Symmetry: C2
Subunit: 175 residues, 2 copies
């Protein structure tokens, strides 16, 4: 935006925390909280921080305009609407992902399974990307270990395609 004479309205919001990047991630590392909204380094916006895992954080710019907000190219009546329409279904998604039989917490620890490969079947694992916070890595071994990125929003997104959960993704990916 450009600067206004009044405090940004999101300052008054209960989810708004006066944190920078490190403080947000710190606070989230040791909180039960899954997300917060922090201050942006320049005027006009705050930033939604969602903890994907202990060391995976997603920071999304939320812009404040005269009545509405915008977040990820979508438009929202208020911050509460960002949370219900946008954040909760992400969390619902993250919950399923980490419940999955085939989800692991580290690449390093999804390592064991990928190495157990006989030649009998494709071995595959899932773990969140640290190189691209917000991506789920689909890793598989068919002879060589390959990797693919899946987007994590309210759905799982893979190239053109879109999935409610890992299961349906798996179904599509094989056949």
């Amino acid at each position: 935006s450009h600067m206004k004479y009044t405090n940004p309205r999101f300052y008054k919001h209960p989810l708004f925390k006066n944190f920078n990047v490190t403080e947000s991630e710190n606070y989230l590392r040791s909180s039960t909280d899954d997300f917060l909204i922090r201050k942006g380094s320049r005027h006009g916006y705050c930033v939604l921080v969602i903890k994907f895992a202990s060391d995976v954080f997603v920071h999304m710019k939320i812009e404040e305009h005269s009545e509405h907000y915008t977040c990820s190219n979508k438009h929202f009546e208020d911050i509460d609407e960002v949370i219900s329409v946008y954040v909760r279904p992400i969390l619902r998604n993250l919950k399923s992902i980490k419940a999955h039989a085939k989800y692991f917490n580290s690449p390093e620890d999804a390592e064991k399974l990928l190495s157990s490969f006989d030649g009998s079947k494709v071995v595959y694992a899932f773990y969140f990307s640290r190189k691209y916070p917000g991506k789920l890595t689909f890793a598989y071994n068919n002879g060589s270990i390959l990797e693919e990125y899946i987007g994590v929003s309210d759905m799982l997104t893979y190239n053109n395609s879109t999935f409610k959960d890992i299961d349906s993704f798996v179904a599509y990916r094989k056949r």
Copy 2:
């Protein structure tokens, strides 16, 4: 919105036509043009009208706010951005759809094919919905003629799932 003292900015836009619903569809029926933006019946917005077929028109509210516009829950810097980001890929989609081997122009005329059913295979056809302008009807005969709606945006959307074209949709739907 509520009323302002200045003309809505979209009046100045070259794609804006001072038409109501009938005039828009009329004009589109007999134009080579695929879409236009028309006046809304109340303040604060114009309406994108896309011709899907001779008697299928999709009307989408485009709201004008102080600098940005909104259309289908998405946010746009200007009307031009609505067109490139939103309308052209719809048109690219519509083009493919009507190119498809399995697309027909009327339900009535996708009737022949659905009746040719032997028992040898599932017979299926595609045609745009008139009951829900903006939907593509996927019709199939496996014993009885069933129907399903696919959304037409930049992608084809079917329940949870999303497709670039009919072909990949077909692939998914069978197996």
